[PDB]
Design a protein around this ligand. Structure first.
Ligand SMILES: O=C(O)[C@H]1O[C@H](O)[C@H](O)[C@@H](O)[C@@H]1O
Ligand SMILES: [Ca+2]
Ligand SMILES: [Ca+2]
Length: 139
C-alpha cells in the first residue's frame, strides 16, 4: 500500500494550508482546504499497469454537514468519481472513506475537490492499494 502524506513525494497541492493544530493525524499534519466550493487536495500516483485500485482517504469533519468531494483523475480525462464525507463529530475524530477507481498506466493526478461552499473536511492521508504504484509527477 502506497501511503501518501503531506510533505512527501506524491503530495502535490492543497488549496488552503497544511495544518497540525488538531490531534490524531499521521505524518506531519493534514491538508486543510479553503472553505470554498472546488477547493482541492491533489496527489500524483504512477501505476505500472492500468487497473482498479482502492483509494482510502482519512479525514476529519467537525462541521455540521457532509462535505462531499469530487475525485477526478487527470483533470477528468481519466475518471470522475464522488466521495462521501460525512461529519466525524469533531476535528479530532478521524474516519476513512474508500472508493475504487481505475488508474491508467503511468501518471495519475488525483484531485479531490469540495462540492460545497464549506470546502473539504481536513484530509490526513491518501492510501492506495492495487498492483504496483508509487509517487507520481505533479505536472
Ligand atoms: O470548517 C473548516 O474547514 C475549518 O474549521 C476550523 O477552522 C477548523 O479548526 C479547521 O481545521 C477546519 O478546516
Ligand atoms: Ca477548511
Ligand atoms: Ca497526514
Amino acid at each position: 500500500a502506497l501511503l501518501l502524506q503531506e510533505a512527501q513525494a506524491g503530495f502535490c497541492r492543497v488549496d488552503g494550508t497544511i495544518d497540525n493544530n488538531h490531534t490524531g493525524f499521521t505524518g506531519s499534519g493534514f491538508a486543510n482546504t479553503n472553505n470554498a466550493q472546488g477547493a482541492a487536495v491533489v496527489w500524483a500516483i504512477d501505476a505500472t499497469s492500468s487497473g482498479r485500485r482502492t483509494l482510502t482517504i482519512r479525514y476529519a469533519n467537525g462541521g455540521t454537514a457532509n462535505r462531499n468531494g469530487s475525485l477526478v483523475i487527470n483533470g477528468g480525462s481519466n475518471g470522475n468519481y464522488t466521495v462521501s464525507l460525512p461529519t466525524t463529530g469533531a476535528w479530532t475524530t478521524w474516519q476513512t472513506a474508500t472508493i475504487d477507481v481505475d488508474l491508467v498506466q503511468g501518471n495519475n493526478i488525483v484531485q479531490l475537490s469540495a462540492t460545497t461552499a464549506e470546502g473539504l473536511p481536513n484530509i490526513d492521508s491518501l492510501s492506495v492499494v492495487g498492483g504496483t504504484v508509487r509517487a507520481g509527477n505533479c505536472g
